[PDB]
Design a protein around this nucleic acid. Structure first.
Ligand SMILES: [Zn+2]
Length: 60
DNA sequence: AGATAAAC
DNA sequence: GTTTATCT
């Protein structure tokens, strides 16, 4: 039940992987990934109503 | 969960 | 070049 777990980095409640930060900040995996890229705070301008999805990667 | 690779 | 979701 992650209803209420608002991503402390982008306020998104729908996430592909709830990255529970050790400090106690539930941040949607997307924030944890891009954060590792530039190591800065993500503006939720790229957020969306439901979890984004596409042609799932074919089983390799 | 974390890692991988894909797709735009 | 760049970013995230689904994969395992
Ligand atoms: Zn987030």
């Amino acid at each position: 039940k992650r209803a209420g777990t608002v991503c402390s980095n982008c306020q998104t409640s729908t996430t592909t992987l709830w990255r529970r930060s050790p400090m106690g900040d539930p941040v949607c995996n997307a924030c944890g990934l891009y954060y590792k890229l530039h190591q800065v705070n993500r503006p939720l301008t790229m957020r969306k109503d439901g979890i984004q999805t596409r042609n799932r990667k074919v089983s390799s």
